[PDB]
């Protein structure tokens, strides 16, 4: 019962909770505490090979019940402890007794009535640890707490052969090579089945057209049901003339021949539901600080996984299938990718068998039989989506209460995350109370249906992000959650979010996988990276051509009229005479569709603009969805309908309107949208979000200018490079990169003089790596870059395959008049969607990953002997027209520029270290060459998100790795304000750590009016092994990936970037690049940068407090950098930033101030007046010392009680009248008697007894507070005529 000082306060990694501020009738704090003791040898709980995990996990809970203690003590309003609440050990546990109307029986001095018996399931709740606490908004003295098994804390301290990574490290006895794990071999035309290809259109309907050509016609696709019981009559989408390679057996996804010891959950969703000790629990409870019966329980609820999993959409029963079905399934399996939308090869955390089902087989549909008419029918599923142990505790934490209900939005996932395993919050639980809190109910739902109402009007940031959905919930949003809180009147959510997969919307031609190893590895789950990568030379003409159509030019000798390689210059010209042969005749029907004889082409932005799951102006509209992200790749914050979250029913009902088509005849004429059925309710849940935000309130290239303005945390230098001939270039924006020229020669050669720039000359900067005939001929290029297919001569213009014959006999060649000046991934073209590479998804992806500082760089050369690359005499910033500018042209991260990023990281030159590290990239014309991506040297990740904190009625922010971020204007936007502020940490001992987020101890609001955070450089620990006996090249760690070799042909010595750079067979390339394979592990990068050991210097200890930058109403006003009247908005913002590079704090950008403390930092507990560190920092409350209730020997009872107590107070409000205050309370000389009064809390007139509590004006605040020193019974007392 009474306080034990041996338990000390702490912060859980998954929600960053440590205390709740109590509010209303009796203020104070609840906070988590644990035993201080060291030497916790969990590895002593031995695991045998012959049994399952459950008896081991129960033995670990039984061991932790002996080795540690945990509790939830109450504190007063100044942080003095009151009572202990060790839930495993407290005396005489009971539920609260009720009246017939459901109300708890209570009287403040006595406390609650206790029934004398514990709640339900007490024999298995007593082993659980509490991890989050909240208060009822409408009911007095009523609170809620969330509890979990202690393994949900100790998960990283359990032994390493059971708590494994999702990928093996291997013994490397043959030396390391990242290509050995990759399934790589490309498919081929079937030697015995060539003839089943789509038929050419033998005659084509006129449609009142007139023109003609010599070229081959469109290909027919037909589907119809027939009369047979298990077959169609036609099904041309299900044709299969391609088959997989044989290379010592068939190449396919086949988990049992790859995973010899397959990674699996600690427990399955059907175990956690039934083993009631391993599921999470919420309980209601009642508390009062100064009663005899001070605490007792309400009711108990299980956070049962089945109450979430049975509320998954119907398609989540078949995650290997999607609404495009048979052709998309085959195209993905031919490219060795994940089929459907959620399979375990990428996402094993949500599947009960983990990696052991990492295959495309048996997708819940009949596929792979001997006849295309026999495939394409619904059947039994092989593996549904579940909620296993790792994903389950990532879906636990971040509570809020609304009306008669309470919620769980899930954590950041640091309960259960591992270096190759990414569990997240996938939705929200709700617990609801009924019959005046006599009964309760529990439920949950995924974010996929709750976010279904998102549209472009609901954000002040960029538009068209990959957040859209349709009648099938195949888009699956999930989050690392920062929290949910009240911002004044508005309920708000914050965290980091998964978009749809932006890296695989462009798609390969079928044969070329052996020269594209990273692009397939990024789809295979072997490389768990979400960034977009420049790869255009190997893409097909459209992502959506069916597999029966591909085999129409195996030689390449016609440049594949229906299907060929994506080069932008050699697209077929529609002109206007051309259309009648290529599209303006081929009408579709209720059983007939066509594949056109037209060479479609375009770069990364045109690919995403057509086939990404983009937002639009109306809900459920997005007919295209690709795949779902590995990790969070967006910032996210939102305003919620707190009313609708309270009003929605517990059970969601889906129906046949959310099912996939039962057979392919219903897939051919597939309905895009439907009304809800009379029994269903899923459409009600779509509208829980009012508004959302994703980054700065900036538009177009202006957003890339902000990306260049912020400092890199590894060196304090902005990516814009301007604050110091032969000077370096920026990475994100195009301003001052290459040279200016007028766009007057591009595409249509029209409108540019008056409807593009505010000025008479249409100037745009041509960017890094560009094509021109001469330095004088700087505007446009003609169709001079004609290209051969093999050695078989050029593209053949004025040839009869590239001509048409309309009426009158006039004819002309089907090609461009003039073209854009650059194709590089940095491109930012306003006029040319088919040549621009920057996109709004990539802008938001780069914003997040440049804050965490973990954008990768492409390398040929390391700091090792004879392997070096130089800052000088080897790079030419003034000559971007040639190979001496070192622009890669393949394998580069989209939107940015690699050599600039390498300069900002300081991988070459003395920028980051006292001597030149000599690491980098070079373009050579003398020989064939090899490269790989490598990490930045930093180990932060997008799941490193901390507490949401609210500063006032409109401003809020959160910790995100080494940053604090504030969304100051989201509730009330303004013109000329960017909407964001940022503060960076400075300490090199934290920033260069190996698992850096483990040093963050929590973030909090402080009573001087600022957010603050705690750090401890003594809190870091080593990796799961110390290499022990062998050269660990693949050290599994939070920034490591299995990046593959890229192999590339020699660069041209002049006019280097006039064509796309050509890759070659990389399948043996690893032998030439062993230094780069050693440089994949971040510790080896840090060692060559001089950061890997004690040479980092600074403070040896130095834990303490961090604080965000100062702010005023002017902070973030950039109105002179916004709008235009002479030029392009990014360029005037660049001018506005250049004079402010040394003065970033008025933009709201800077470094957090810091102060050191003595000893360890373990956590904080918080009050409305003060914050306590490790539970210390309390004070005597010196302004209140002179206020006290009169003692019983100083009461003249006849003066008080000749009148009944019935009229000492106003019946409308229960405050005692002023005349009785100095008769009951002592006060100092000169005191303001209007500043204090008494509130009645219980009474009875037949006993003449009056019970009261005192409230006084806070000297610091426009609000009243209790006076806790006022008596031996605290701020509460009773008075009566001697009959006590």
């Amino acid at each position: 019962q009474a306080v034990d000082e041996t338990l000390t306060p702490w912060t859980w990694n998954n929600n960053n909770f440590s205390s709740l501020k109590i509010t209303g009738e009796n203020p104070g704090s609840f906070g988590l505490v644990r035993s201080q003791n060291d030497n916790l040898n969990i590895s002593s709980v031995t695991k045998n090979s012959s049994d399952d995990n459950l008896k081991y996990l129960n033995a670990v809970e039984k061991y932790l019940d002996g080795q540690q203690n945990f509790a939830i003590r109450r504190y007063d309003n100044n942080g003095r402890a009151l009572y202990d609440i060790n839930l495993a050990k407290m005396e005489n546990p009971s539920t609260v007794q009720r009246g017939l109307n459901g109300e708890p029986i209570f009287d403040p001095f006595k406390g609650f009535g206790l029934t004398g018996n514990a709640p339900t399931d007490w024999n298995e709740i007593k082993g659980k640890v509490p991890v989050e606490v909240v208060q009822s908004p409408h009911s007095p003295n009523l609170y809620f707490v969330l509890l979990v098994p202690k393994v949900a804390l100790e998960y990283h301290n359990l032994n390493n052969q059971v708590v494994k990574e999702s990928l093996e490290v291997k013994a490397t006895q043959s030396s390391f090579n990242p290509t050995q794990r990759l399934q790589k071999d490309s498919p081929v035309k079937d030697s015995s089945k060539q003839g089943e290809k789509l038929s050419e259109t033998t005659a084509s309907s006129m449609s009142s057209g007139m023109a003609t050509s010599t070229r081959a016609k469109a290909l027919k696709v037909e589907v119809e049901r027939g009369s047979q019981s298990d077959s169609l009559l036609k099904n041309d989408f299900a044709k299969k003339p391609l088959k997989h390679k044989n290379s010592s057996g068939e190449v396919k996804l086949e988990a049992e021949k790859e995973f010899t010891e397959a990674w699996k959950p600690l427990l399955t969703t059907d175990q956690i539901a039934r083993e009631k000790g391993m599921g999470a629990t919420v309980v209601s409870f009642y508390d009062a600080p100064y009663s005899e019966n001070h605490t007792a329980f309400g009711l108990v609820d299980h956070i049962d996984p089945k109450k979430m999993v049975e509320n998954y959409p119907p398609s989540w029963k078949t995650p290997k299938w999607n609404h495009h079905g048979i052709w998309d399934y085959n195209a993905r399996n031919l490219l060795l990718q994940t089929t459907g939308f959620f399979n375990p090869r990428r996402h094993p955390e949500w599947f009960d068998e983990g990696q052991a089902k990492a295959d495309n087989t048996s997708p819940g549909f009949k596929v792979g039989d001997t006849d295309h008419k026999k495939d394409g029918f619904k059947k039994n599923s092989s593996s549904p989506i579940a909620l296993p142990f790792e994903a389950y505790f990532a879906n636990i934490g971040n509570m809020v209460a609304i009306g008669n209900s309470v919620f769980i939005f899930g954590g950041n996932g640091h309960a259960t995350k591992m270096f190759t395993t990414n569990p997240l919050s996938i939705g929200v639980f709700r617990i609801k109370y009924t019959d005046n809190f006599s009964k309760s109910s529990v439920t949950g739902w995924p974010y996929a249906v709750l976010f279904g109402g998102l549209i472009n009007p609901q954000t002040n940031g960029l538009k068209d992000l990959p957040l859209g959905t349709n009648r099938w919930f195949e888009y699956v949003p999930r989050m690392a959650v920062s929290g949910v809180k009240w911002v004044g009147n508005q309920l708000v959510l914050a965290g980091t979010l998964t978009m749809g997969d932006t890296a695989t919307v462009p798609r390969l031609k079928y044969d070329q996988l052996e020269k594209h190893l990273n692009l397939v590895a990024q789809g295979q789950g072997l490389l768990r990276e979400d960034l977009q990568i420049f790869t255009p030379y190997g893409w097909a003409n459209r992502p959506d051509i069916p597999v029966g159509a591909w085999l129409q030019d195996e030689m390449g000798s016609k440049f594949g009229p229906h299907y060929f390689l994506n080069n932008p210059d050699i697209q077929d010209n529609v002109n206007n005479d051309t259309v009648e042969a290529l599209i303006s005749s081929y009408k579709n029907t209720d059983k007939l569709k066509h594949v056109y004889p037209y060479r479609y082409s375009g770069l990364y932005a045109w690919q995403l603009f057509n086939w990404s799951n983009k937002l639009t102006n109306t809900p459920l509209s997005a007919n295209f969805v690709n795949e779902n992200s590995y990790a969070p790749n967006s910032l996210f914050a939102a305003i919620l309908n707190e009313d609708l979250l309270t009003g929605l029913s517990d059970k969601i009902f889906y129906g046949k309107e959310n099912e996939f088509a039962e057979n392919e005849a219903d897939r051919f004429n597939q309905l895009l949208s439907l009304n809800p059925n009379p029994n269903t309710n899923w459409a009600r849940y779509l509208n829980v979000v009012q508004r959302f935000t994703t980054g700065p309130n900036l538009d177009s290239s202006t957003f890339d200018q902000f990306l260049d303005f912020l400092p890199w945390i590894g060196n304090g230098k902005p990516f814009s490079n301007s604050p110091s001939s032969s000077t370096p270039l920026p990475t994100f924006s195009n301003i001052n990169v290459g040279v200016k020229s007028m766009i007057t020669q591009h595409l249509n050669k029209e409108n540019t003089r008056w409807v593009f720039i505010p000025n008479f000359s249409p100037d745009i900067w041509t960017g890094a790596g560009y094509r021109v005939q001469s330095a004088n001929q700087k505007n446009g290029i003609p169709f001079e870059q004609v290209k051969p297919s093999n050695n078989s001569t050029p593209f053949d213009p004025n040839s009869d395959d590239n001509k048409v014959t309309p009426s009158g006999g006039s004819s002309k060649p089907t090609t461009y008049p003039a073209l854009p000046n650059s194709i590089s991934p940095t491109s930012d073209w306003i006029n040319a969607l088919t040549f621009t590479n920057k996109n709004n998804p990539q802008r938001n992806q780069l914003l997040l990953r440049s804050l965490l500082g973990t954008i990768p760089v492409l390398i040929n050369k390391s700091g090792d002997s004879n392997d070096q690359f130089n800052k000088d005499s080897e790079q030419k910033w003034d000559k971007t027209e040639t190979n001496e500018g070192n622009l890669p042209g393949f394998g580069e991260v989209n939107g940015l520029y690699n050599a600039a990023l390498l300069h900002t990281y300081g991988f070459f030159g003395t920028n980051t270290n006292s001597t030149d590290p000599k690491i980098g990239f070079k373009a050579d014309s003398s020989s064939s060459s090899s490269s790989t991506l490598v990490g930045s040297g930093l180990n932060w990740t997008s799941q490193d998100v901390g507490n949401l904190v609210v500063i006032n009625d409109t401003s809020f922010g959160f910790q995100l790795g080494g940053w604090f971020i504030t969304f100051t204007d989201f509730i009330r936007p303004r013109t000329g304000y960017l909407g964001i502020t940022l503060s960076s940490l400075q300490d090199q001992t934290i920033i260069w750590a190996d698992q850096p987020w483990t040093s963050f101890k929590g973030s909090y609001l402080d009573s001087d009016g600022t957010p603050k955070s705690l750090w401890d450089p003594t809190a870091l620990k080593s990796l799961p092994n110390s290499s022990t006996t062998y050269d660990t090249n693949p050290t599994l760690s939070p920034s490591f990936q299995l990046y593959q070799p890229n192999k590339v042909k020699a660069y041209q010595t002049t006019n280097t970037y006039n064509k796309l750079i050509e890759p070659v067979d990389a399948t043996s390339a690893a032998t030439n690049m062993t230094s780069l394979l050693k440089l994949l592990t971040t510790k080896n990068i840090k060692a060559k940068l001089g950061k890997g050991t004690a040479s980092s210097q600074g403070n040896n200890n130095g834990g303490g407090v961090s604080q965000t930058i100062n702010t005023i109403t002017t902070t973030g006003n950039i109105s002179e950098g916004l709008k235009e009247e002479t030029s392009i908005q990014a360029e005037t913002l660049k001018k506005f930033f250049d004079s402010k590079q040394n003065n970033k704090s008025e933009i709201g950008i800077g470094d957090s101030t810091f102060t050191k403390m003595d000893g360890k930092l373990t956590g904080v507990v918080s009050t409305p007046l003060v914050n306590l560190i490790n539970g210390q920092g309390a004070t005597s409350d010196s302004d209140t010392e002179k206020i006290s209730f009169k003692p019983g020997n100083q009461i003249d009872f006849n003066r008080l009680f000749t009148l009944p107590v019935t009229e000492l107070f106003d019946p409308n409000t229960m405050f005692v009248y002023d005349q009785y205050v100095p008769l009951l309370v002592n006060l100092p000389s000169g005191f303001d008697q209007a500043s204090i009064r008494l509130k009645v809390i219980s009474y009875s007139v037949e006993n003449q007894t009056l019970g009261v509590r005192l409230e006084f004006k806070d000297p610091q605040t426009q609000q009243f507070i209790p006076v806790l020193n006022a008596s031996s019974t605290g701020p509460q007392t009773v008075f009566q005529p001697f009959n006590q």
């Binding site: 309908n641 009313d643 609708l644 309270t646 009003g647 019935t1206 019946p1211 007139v1245 037949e1246």
Partner: protein
């Protein structure tokens, strides 16, 4: 107001955080008018008029209100709200006691209660001039 078959039926829909749902108990409470224009009053039931329990007469002696006169009490509506305990049928439904002098020594009280439409009804209420 609807017909299932051919007679008219009264359903009450209650707004729950922006979404209206049928309230079957309030529907039955409102529809039980017994041929009158308005829902029945039952002493022992939380009906459309909530539920009103009067204090015993013995409250006057206990609280020393016998020393107050009828005119005092009658002009002290907070005293005469202490003459009943009210249970609302729907949240924030309100009720007061109207007092009437009966003798030198006695008064009567009669509840004034809000219906679903936000309006108060009592013994003298009309619609279209017709006493309810």
């Amino acid at each position: 107001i609807a017909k299932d078959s051919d007679q008219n039926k009264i359903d009450i829909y209650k707004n729950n955080n922006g979404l209206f749902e049928i309230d079957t108990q309030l529907s039955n409470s409102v529809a039980t008018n017994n041929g009158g224009l308005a829902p029945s009053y039952t002493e022992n039931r939380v009906d459309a008029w909530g539920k009103v329990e009067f204090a015993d007469n013995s409250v006057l002696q206990a609280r020393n209100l016998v020393d107050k006169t009828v005119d005092e009490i009658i002009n002290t509506p907070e005293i005469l709200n202490s003459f009943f305990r009210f249970t609302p049928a729907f949240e924030d439904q309100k009720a007061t006691l109207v007092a009437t002098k009966q003798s030198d020594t006695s008064l009567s009280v009669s509840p004034r209660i809000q219906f679903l439409d936000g309006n108060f009804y009592d013994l003298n209420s009309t619609i279209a001039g017709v006493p309810l």
